[PDB]
From Swiss-Prot, chain A:
This is Polymerase basic protein 2. Belongs to the influenza viruses PB2 family. GO terms for cellular component: host cell nucleus; virion component. Plays an essential role in transcription initiation and cap-stealing mechanism, in which cellular capped pre-mRNAs are used to generate primers for viral transcription. Recognizes and binds a wide range of cap structures of target pre-RNAs which are subsequently cleaved after 10-13 nucleotides by the viral protein PA. Plays a role in the initiation of the viral genome replication and modulates the activity of the ribonucleoprotein (RNP) complex. The gene is PB2. It comes from Influenza C virus (strain C/Johannesburg/1/1966). Keywords: Cap snatching, Eukaryotic host gene expression shutoff by virus, Eukaryotic host transcription shutoff by virus, Host gene expression shutoff by virus, Host nucleus, Host-virus interaction, Inhibition of host RNA polymerase II by virus, mRNA capping, mRNA processing, Viral transcription, Virion. It is found in: Virion; Host nucleus. Influenza RNA polymerase is composed of three subunits: PB1, PB2 and PA. Interacts (via N-terminus) with PB1 (via C-terminus). Interacts with nucleoprotein NP (via N-terminus). Interacts with host ANP32A (via C-terminus); this interaction promotes viral RNA synthesis.
UniProtKB/Swiss-Prot annotation, chain C:
Keywords: Eukaryotic host gene expression shutoff by virus, Eukaryotic host transcription shutoff by virus, Host cytoplasm, Host gene expression shutoff by virus, Host nucleus, Host-virus interaction, Inhibition of host RNA polymerase II by virus, Nucleotide-binding, Nucleotidyltransferase, Phosphoprotein, RNA-directed RNA polymerase, Transferase, Viral RNA replication, Viral transcription. Its main location: host cell. This is RNA-directed RNA polymerase catalytic subunit. It catalyses: RNA(n) + a ribonucleoside 5'-triphosphate = RNA(n+1) + diphosphate. It comes from Influenza C virus (strain C/Johannesburg/1/1966). The lineage of its organism: Viruses, Riboviria, Orthornavirae, Negarnaviricota, Polyploviricotina. RNA-dependent RNA polymerase which is responsible for replication and transcription of virus RNA segments. The transcription of viral mRNAs occurs by a unique mechanism called cap-snatching. 5' methylated caps of cellular mRNAs are cleaved after 10-13 nucleotides by PA. In turn, these short capped RNAs are used as primers by PB1 for transcription of viral mRNAs. During virus replication, PB1 initiates RNA synthesis and copy vRNA into complementary RNA (cRNA) which in turn serves as a template for the production of more vRNAs. The keyword Transcription regulation does not apply.
Amino acid sequence: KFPIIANKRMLEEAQIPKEHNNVALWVLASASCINYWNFCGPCVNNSEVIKEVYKSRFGRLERRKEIMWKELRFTLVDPERMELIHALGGETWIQEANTAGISNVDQRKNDIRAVCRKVCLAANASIMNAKSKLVEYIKSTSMRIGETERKLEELILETDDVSPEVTLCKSALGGQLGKTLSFGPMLLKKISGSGVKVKDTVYIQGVRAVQFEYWSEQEEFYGEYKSATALFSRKERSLEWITIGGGINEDRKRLLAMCMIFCRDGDYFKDAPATITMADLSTKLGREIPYQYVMMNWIQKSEDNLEALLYSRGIVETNPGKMGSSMGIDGSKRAIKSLRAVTIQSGKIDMPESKEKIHLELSDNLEAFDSSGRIVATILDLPSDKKVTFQDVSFQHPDLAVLRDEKTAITKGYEALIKRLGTGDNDIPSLIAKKDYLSLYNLPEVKLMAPLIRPNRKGVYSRVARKLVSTQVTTGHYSLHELIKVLPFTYFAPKQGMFEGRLFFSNDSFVEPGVNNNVFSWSKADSSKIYCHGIAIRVPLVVGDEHMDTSLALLEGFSVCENDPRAPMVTRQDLIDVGFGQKVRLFVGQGSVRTFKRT
Amino acid sequence: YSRVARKLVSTQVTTGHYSLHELIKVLPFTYFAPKQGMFEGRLFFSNDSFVEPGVNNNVFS
Amino acid sequence: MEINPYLMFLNNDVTSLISTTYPYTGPPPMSHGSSTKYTLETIKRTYDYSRTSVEKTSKVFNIPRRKFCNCLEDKDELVKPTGNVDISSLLGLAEMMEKRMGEGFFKHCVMEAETEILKMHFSRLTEGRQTYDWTSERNMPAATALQLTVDAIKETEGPFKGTTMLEYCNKMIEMLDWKEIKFKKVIDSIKHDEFLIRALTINTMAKDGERGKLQRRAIATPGMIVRPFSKIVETVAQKICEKLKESGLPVGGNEKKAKLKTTVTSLNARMNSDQFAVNITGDNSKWNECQQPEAYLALLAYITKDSSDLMKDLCSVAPVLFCNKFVKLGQGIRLSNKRKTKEVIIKAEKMGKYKNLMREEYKNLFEPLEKYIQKDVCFLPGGMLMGMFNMLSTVLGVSTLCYMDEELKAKGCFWTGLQSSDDFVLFAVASNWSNIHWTIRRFNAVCKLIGINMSLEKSYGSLPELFEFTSMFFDGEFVSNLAMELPAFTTAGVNEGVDFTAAMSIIKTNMINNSLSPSTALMALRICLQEFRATYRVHPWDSRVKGGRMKIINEFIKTIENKDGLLIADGGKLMNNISTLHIPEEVLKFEKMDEQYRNRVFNPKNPFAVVSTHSFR
């Protein structure tokens, strides 16, 4: 009851009465005594002393406040921070938060590569105007790159960073290349040998057939994947030998599978899996796809496909003296059994360099060709479209961005509703003072916002909104906020039905009167503002009482009244069977109860 | 309410398959003239006490 | 339709889903008890794992003394546990380890432990899980029994003015020879033999709280006399385990993963292309019923052989104290009639008086031990039941692992690994799928030579990539931990300004050890906040609660505007997040709390981590 101990003179000197409001507080004492002491008690000024004594803790807080938070990225492994290393970097993730150092180049590289990917994808919407629409997009795209407002017609060239998108977009500019290749996300290069194209067939389901191409001669390459080097030689649709010097399980597995596809080694180039027959669609929406990229995509779906591909490659039992340079199905550095024609080692294979620049030729599908075919890049080797917010950018030509969503549609509708006010005749305040609400049910803006409304039960929404509008207009008691909130629904015709307390749009969102919400919120002491997803909007007018009267914006045929606990709690349905002079409590929100009376 | 009550009565009376414990309950509402509206399952008096036609409650069981 | 929540283990790993196998951390509702049945089976299995039959009646009790050390017999069926130790092999392994690490290694460690002890205050003994009072004959925290002991010394032969560990130990020693000793009771005194026994008494505690396995049904609970010597020995063993690469006891997590990967990489860089290694997840069984304090004593002697005789004699205290340890038998058996309408209750000391009534199972487990009983306890002359000397056991295990000879070298094979207290992971090396078996058998033999056994139904092995250690399921990658700890307010209530900060620090730590992730940490935070509130019966102001503390808060609230600055204990709301855990909420709301409220809270002229006006003395 009074387990907590206290002092006596310290209590009387503060004049702490027991049972202040039936709370004893107490030598012994309760816990509420601390609340009574901190809410009504003596006043000191010891802030400076406290800060000085707790200097270390408050300096830690200061340091924390002295941070410029940066982005984060999911990845792996190939003092003042120790206080925060827990929140700075784990093992799968990491945050690039910095303190004082600034250098904006690699982020600029990421931005430019992302936008190049974006534009090159956008140009993949026709069959004939590929290069034209591409170049015109480029010419209509400028950026505040770093600190300089530059255009995207010189950055692609001035930059030196190999990538499928950079090359695919620069070839159209007759720009210099570096003899580098891109088969999917992997990076390849030639070392010696040469050959010519040759065609062959492959079955699907055991009946059909499809043509693919390859090379018949011997040729050595230098594969390379994330944290994984390699070297290998392809001969007659099959992989002869290969070696690796970057030790990781997943990286090595994926790199090996990609190099095998590049060599088309394996039986799945004779027949196809039973999963492909489920589709047999080596085609885009309206375009064609080779077999290699289809196989790759089939790999990306699940690692079981990768394991199956690798099993297609012969597996054998390792012999002595080779464990150190053997491999396993899961990338294991050494094993008692390994795969045929493999060699593991340590140390990344030093990559060669080609100092010979060239220019390629784009095709209908934008595939570039330097010579003897030998595709260097394409859109097929790109990721799927990934929406990302772009800043420091200007994109003027059509196809720049859809920039059309239900959220933005509603935002613009509400902006129009707000501007319509216009502090003039034939606008909201004039019709209010005139008590002509029927015209409100015919404005253009509500007609533009109507499509955003849930169609199945729009009649009841319109009924309720018109009820509220008329009840607030006729009497003259109203609140512009809730009115504008419900107006978009006062267009269609009213009907009978069951209402619940929320008005649903077509995007599964909703709005509710007498409450605030992300889509629409407002509060007093800032009534000149209306938030929309946090976007503060302004009112072309000023009001101090036009909103203060919300007694009719909560329910339809009721009005708020003084609080009374005796009144029984009810729902929105039983309301129909109520009478007059009969108060009733009811929830108006989350843990928000209010009393109401009819009329 | 009057409409509903009169309806039930006719339905029970025309055939002969009636329950005397429901007429004695719903009759007090048949005095007025029928009208149009949504019946929401319960018949209220002027003292916020209702009776329901078919289930027993504190007011009529 | 049917269900099987294991099919997700086929197309996925195990390091990602293993957590779903064990329940969430917390206090075990099993109520693992310590009953007379349990106390007696343990003692029997102890005397049995001793494969000898020799004895020697003492002179201080007139009782036999099963000497199970350096007298191995009953070689048959030796795959089962053993406790008979060989001193020669033990000292040989110690010498190997010394040679490896260095000559003046043990000397440096013992010197460090000494100097650390010198400046130590006996008051440190107050920091302990629990102990056993030798006056009230119960279990309590260390501070209570310490106060009891000091006030008894005061009442009997004047106060103890040492204020240091060494004077405390010497005072205990002197008290071992006192004939009469006094203490306040319900006052009473006792003689020499009874006080000796009480000091050498031990009680079985039922508490066993941890993840993994709660095998600590009868965890020991010693008194206070032996406490400081045990602390000294543990300090020395710790100073030793730090320099050892294969010692994951003193710390875990980041450092543990570092050790793991260092070991693995050194291995990979050590052997050749012809050799192929293997791993084994081992789990020593009966790590408490096969550790003998006599071997520990000989080992400590060999260690301190070249050092101050002070430490030589000191380190030789706790061992002998464990060579003679009376064990308090739990609550006695109970009788009952047929219909069970009546039920007698009897203590342990009198079960030897009604041995005729007891059922055959209890009867065949009690007579052979009646010899060692004195009044109600059992004179256990060895073993090691407490969770003590864990550092020392780990040192012995590392000694086992640092072995190597020429018989192996000739075959081109070897081993290495890591060992916790009673759990380990081995990495063998060879060039044939058979010599591996020979090496494993050699290792098991050398381990059994000194009582360190291994389980067969709980110890497995496979290729090097996969293993487990202390719930840290290692794999080629994706090292997954499972040691997610949490606080508990109801059991440990301190103040409304410390528990929350402590929980934040705990969550931060768990995140460091990778046992927690951002979203998981945030969920745990929002859960612990509610636990705290419900504990101290507090809620925010937005809520429509009617509790006592809220009444006043429901009226003195409108007088403030900085609701954000309010304290959680006073209708406050949270403002700390991941990047603001080390920062207490107070430091985070100081500049924001209304001047009046800030001052009402920060008033050293009050009747009572940032020292708040929220303490519950």
